[PDB]
Amino acid sequence: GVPTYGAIILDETLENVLLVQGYLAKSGWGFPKGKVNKEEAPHDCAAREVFEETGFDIKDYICKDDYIELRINDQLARLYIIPGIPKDTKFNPKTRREIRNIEWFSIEKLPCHRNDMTPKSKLGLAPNKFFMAIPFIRPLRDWLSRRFG
Numbered sequence: 001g002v003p004t005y006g007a008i009i010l011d012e013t014l015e016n017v018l019l020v021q022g023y024l025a026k027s028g029w030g031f032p033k034g035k036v037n038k039e040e041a042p043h044d045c046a047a048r049e050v051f052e053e054t055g056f057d058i059k060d061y062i063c064k065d066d067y068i069e070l071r072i073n074d075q076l077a078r079l080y081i082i083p084g085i086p087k088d089t090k091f092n093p094k095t096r097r098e099i100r101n102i103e104w105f106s107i108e109k110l111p112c113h114r115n116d117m118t119p120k121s122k123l124g125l126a127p128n129k130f131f132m133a134i135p136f137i138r139p140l141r142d143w144l145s146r147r148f149g
């Protein structure tokens, strides 16, 4: 699969993260991100996708070595970490044909796994509207501990 790039944006207290909600197959909440174009650099893809989905320009804030990268089913996703963005920033997507809503979420209240269905003696996982964000949550909490305290 083609690699994806985007951002984990936090506010000034470091408590809250910015998620976006799409439609249809992307109907839950996730970090803003998308597919890299031919010959496009990673930092430039991350700024472009984030500006298309939120209207906020990260280009002056990106730090090259401050990101979390995961490989999921053989596709690579890298999210640059962007702290200290004020909670009263006004966000607006380019087209609301792609993005339903944009909200701040408390980091400590978000799940870092889905729940099983062992009460039903049934295999698999229950649905969760944060399914796209979940894989990054534990690594993010660990990264904030190591780099802030």
Ligand SMILES: CN(C)c1ccncc1
Residues within 6 Å of the ligand: 089, 090, 091, 092, 093, 100, 101, 102, 103, 104
């Ligand atoms: C600023 N903010 C939280 C939003 C703006 C645009 N769409 C939804 C929410």
